[PDB]
Design a protein around this ligand. Structure first.
Ligand SMILES: OC[C@@H]1O[C@@H](O)[C@H](O)[C@H]1O
Ligand SMILES: OC[C@@H]1O[C@@H](O)[C@H](O)[C@H]1O
Ligand SMILES: OC[C@@H]1O[C@@H](O)[C@H](O)[C@H]1O
Lengths: 495, 495, 496
């Protein structure tokens, strides 16, 4: 019932890179068509972008958006999505068994990222294409002018280069369900050679090597080791993907899965440092966690849609509707991301609009709304800039059906120096027993105490109203005392 | 003089897949140009197809035709053969040192297949092209509309999709004489990935993985093992190729060669089942015998042509003129195919027109006529539909120069119970002795004994007449007693 | 003081293939643009070709020129350089951080080679491209007509096929500074299948497989053995690359480096013979030394030009200005090449115009002069055609900072039978002592003794004048030719 945590400014983990509050838009389902892009809608601007969605994205303070995939990119031909729209083909999207009409391509999606105050992180097709097509796309986007592909961008109506900073070398290609599956050795080579050439066009870019499609793949983490062995000198990040689900309907074990996330991350870091010692390099590889979220609700509808009604434009795929308990895990996942901010410098919640997303528009042009997971992310991105202090914590333990010694209270604190504030994120993942956390600030004024709680752990949000929303609700010597209700998300700020 | 055999509808082998009576047209020599396609000719229809050639193919009841190669496909660019004929290029055909004019492409050959009531088995180029080109060709042929390459087919004048059922992942590429020669691991990888992508576009197709170019390559049968190991989950067949020759002028040892055919088939079946165990699959790989024939007569003239008269259109290559003994061995090969109809589901006489073919057009628009090998195939395709019955047979044996204990009488019975007939196929390949076949027919009337025989084992057919052709030449109890002339082919039907 | 040589016309090494006097033009720096190709210029002809440069090349009697690279070729798309010039794109040259405007492509460069009496040895892109693109280029260039790419050539205004004889399968691709870098097994496989398919289009061409970037690469010589293992039956040559520098500023050691060249050539020959025994083949692979020169003066200015000033048309890259001691090592390398004429059949001075070149044009459109290295190459190419006789030399030796037992004199005799000339090429690389060379022409009138010498080993040529240029002599009565060879000199002594 008690839990003691001592924060101290002097005990840093690292500065937060803001790109860990990024997200991800794939040409999948209604992410784009009847998603952020709805040409005649009364709620859209003259370019067809839903303005209410733009506003909801800006509320999440997303600085970087992965695009356009995802499994989609591994058979995408980028030239299909630029130039006059009347001349753009329709294409089969093999990954998601849909027709892609290519109304949104590089230039429309870059315009959209301007409107939501975000940058693109661009993925290139290394499934069915290779080096020279990555070079062309990079020249098109980043070279000012005076060459075949920069002048082509100019002739398409974009005089200034997009100057995309981070590029991703394909998508995860270790699974037998993706077009252009590669062995680790094949992918290591194409990534090394694509990376080599791209850095010769634009040496200021950063590059992401793709890790395994999940930690459960038998080739994890040898895949990461092999790719980094080949490409180390030319890439800056390795990517990780992780999704969690609660089909077993075990909310106690569900919220313990953040422990598996912590272990996955350290595994990837050890793998990077193993290859570091092997190359005798002084460079550190950072982590790009460019696919993470809860994902399990829509699994069976998606299987129906493929292949019952295949080859639709914008079929409603991956439309997970999230519960309060899902928001609790998304919050736990964010706490775990923060705790490893010394190595994780990029992360993308997957995905942003409609597809397993914090932001939903109702089908056929309907209204936009916030899912339960919208709010833990909004809080983390708003108050979680600054310096991650080392959580030194003793907290009660519990076991679940499949995890052991699960921390009762997961927590981290982030000192914003320019603002003299200190924000403490804490989840009580004791489903039953309320707990108090006593926090010895030895720093270094109790601003507020925002909470995400609800009676019903399976409650949902909808276009008819949010049942889950930040209750701006609930310190005086040096020790801060606030109470963590069972199954709750807590944002405690100090000034 | 005496050989005995028990026929019994309870010792089934398998139901015959009629696709074992298939054939093969490659863009080679006079197969197409000055072959089935002759636009000026008086005997040609509105599309330029020779109508007498069309009639002869239908007499063979060929249900499936492989196209368009062959070594030719390994450097073929299928876009060169579709669209307005005025804009189609002339290409160098490296395999056969010829100019391909591309007057006949997929759409013309598909129309021709309709007129001979056959359908296409399409090979894709995995020599100099790869995944995305195979996907484009499949989309073009099988996707109905609303996408780049399907709409391209429609605009080219073919509104409905061809819906090609069986595709071949390349041609054999183990030979140093083939453009795009692959190692077995290289071919396995590209076959695996091409098949994976193709089945995402059209999951109803079947795919054929290529075997060794012959049983005599050092990489047979490890090539088959390796390809199947990579691609097992996505393919349905493995291909086999076999040609026999009588360059040594030894008819006895020549006719013994279907024994090595049987052994060859067993070797490939064992290879498939070894991999099935390795995979723990419940699927059996079936065999596609998409190249088999006698071929040796024209070998020296083809050296002359490729080496000194290169880059012609329609050079007269591979124009074997077949003898009566060649027809006997073709019959022995058809019997062996029938004996393995449990695993062999597709087979292709290589080839259908002019090129090592049962059908010949003279040259420079001359008349069409039937080679000796035409009639064993016509008999087998006409009456060999139904259930292959296990041959329990005790026959005299003989030695030849290079074969030991060769059975004198080779035989199988097919039981068509929807017509209530039992057709016995038998060859006496003892050339020096006549032999009586006592056939115990555990019942279940004789309707005819049909023969191909001749005194002159080297006699040929020609445009001036057929010397080898079906003769109606000649059981009461339940015991079928049939006299099998030395070096003869026999089709004895009971009902 | 005394070195003795025995020249017998019956002790032969081999007939000299004149393609050992080849050179090389890459789309690099000012080789093409502001070099051989200058449209506006008063010195330029109807095609835009500097006529003064054309005549300078013709004096070197260069029979074959490799083109278009070099690193450049490894990401070159040849179609960008043919067809109407108004429709040719500008492209990023990742190798040299330049813009390639493609005003000179294969058909302009083929015309230029006609004007200097040379042929192209063409390199195909095996970096980012492969089999089918090499087939297309070979058909465009060598197939008469009646097919897609041969007719395309005709449509572009070249009715006759170029009929290019020697093709180079990519460029060396073992280095991490190269677009499309390959492991030895990757390159082995791609070279094998490119070669196989190309020889089906035109069986009369000859093919060069690429060796390592230099002997110093860790994968040398295993790269050469693997590529030859794969492609042996389909290729005719293996390539070698060698450059030398004098950044340590040690003239004696510098001039000893032809000894390393000799060791390098033998190592590659052994490698060929190893694979030959492995293949039980009756065919020897021949050597193509298609990059060799002195190269070091311009390294630092080159590093500055990328970055700081990247993506220019025609940046002034690799503009080494050669000293007299550089010309001596160039002469020593040509002597070494001559001594291995039985296996080296193609060699390429890298490069011909402005880019580490014997011929310079001064930048922004004039005026064109000859570097110090121009002249040993001119002598070797003009008088070094015939039979390499076997060098029997008793030369005094000397040690240097990093080399031992270095001959003071390097010499080789080339017997021309259609002229009754013998030519003795000799270098005295003892920087300190004149040496008399006694040649016993067990033969068989002294025709001349040409000399390249100077008091300043660091003196350079320039547009303002040649400081280094040929002179006579100093200076044969029985069957005994005696000739004093100066301190640090290049010597061409001719008999008739
Ligand atoms: O997040 C959506 C999909 O999940 C993963 O399988 C893919 O990378 C991505 O396309
Ligand atoms: O039947 C002709 C040729 O036989 C084999 O050589 C090839 O696969 C095929 O093109
Ligand atoms: O000679 C110029 C360069 O030297 C080597 O680096 C390359 O092969 C070539 O491009």
């Amino acid at each position: 019932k008690k839990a003691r945590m001592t924060v101290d400014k002097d005990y840093k983990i690292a500065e937060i890179d803001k790109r860990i509050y990024g997200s991800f838009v794939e040409h999948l389902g209604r992410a784009v068509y009847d998603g952020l892009y709805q040409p005649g809608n009364s709620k859209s601007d003259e370019d067809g972008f839903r303005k209410d969605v733009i506003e909801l994205v800006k509320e999440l303070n997303v600085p970087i958006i992965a695009y356009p995939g995802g499994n989609f990119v591994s058979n995408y031909f980028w030239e299909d999505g630029v130039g006059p729209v009347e001349d753009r083909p329709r294409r089969l999207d093999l990954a998601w068994k849909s027709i892609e009409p290519n109304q949104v391509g590089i230039n429309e999606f870059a315009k959209w990222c301007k409107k939501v105050n975000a940058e693109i992180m661009m993925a290139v097709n290394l499934g069915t294409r290779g080096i020279s097509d990555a070079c062309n796309l990079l020249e098109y986007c980043n070279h000012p002018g005076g060459s075949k592909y920069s002048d082509m961008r100019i002739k398409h109506g974009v005089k200034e280069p997009h100057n995309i900073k981070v590029w991703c070398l394909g998508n995860a290609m270790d699974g037998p369900w993706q077009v252009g599956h590669k062995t680790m050795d094949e992918y290591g080579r194409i990534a090394e050679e694509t990376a080599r050439a791209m850095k010769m066009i634009d040496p200021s870019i950063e590059l992401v090597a793709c890790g395994s499609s999940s930690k459960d793949m038998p080739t994890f983490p040898q895949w990461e080791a092999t790719v980094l062995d080949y490409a180390y000198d030319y890439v800056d990040y390795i990517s990780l993907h992780q999704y969690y689900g609660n089909k077993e309907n075990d909310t106690a074990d569900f919220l313990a899965k953040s422990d598996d996330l912590d272990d996955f991350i350290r595994s990837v870091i050890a793998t990077c440092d193993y290859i570091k010692a092997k190359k005798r390099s002084k460079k550190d590889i950072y982590l790009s966690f460019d696919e993470w979220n809860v994902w399990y609700h829509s699994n069976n509808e998606d299987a129906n849609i493929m292949q019952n009604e295949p080859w639709r434009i914008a079929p409603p795929l991956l439309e997970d509707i999230y519960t309060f308990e899902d928001a609790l895990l998304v919050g736990l996942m964010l706490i775990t991301l923060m705790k490893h901010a010394d190595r994780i410098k990029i992360a993308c919640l997957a995905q942003l609009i409609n597809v397993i997303a914090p932001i939903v528009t109702e089908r056929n042009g309907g209204a936009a709304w916030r899912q339960t997971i919208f709010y833990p992310f909004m809080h983390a991105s708003k108050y979680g800039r600054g310096i991650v202090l080392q959580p030194v914590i003793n907290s009660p333990l519990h076991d679940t059906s499949k995890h052991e010694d699960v921390t009762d209270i997961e927590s981290v604190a982030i000192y914003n120096e320019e603002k003299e504030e200190v924000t403490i994120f804490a989840v009580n993942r004791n489903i039953h027993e309320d707990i108090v956390l006593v926090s010895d600030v030895r720093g270094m004024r109790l601003l507020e105490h925002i909470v995400l709680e609800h009676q019903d752990l399976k409650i949902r949000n909808s276009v008819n109203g949010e049942e889950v929303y930040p209750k701006n609700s609930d310190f005086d010597d040096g020790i801060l005392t606030s109470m963590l209700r069972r199954a709750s998300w807590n944002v405690i700020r100090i000034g």
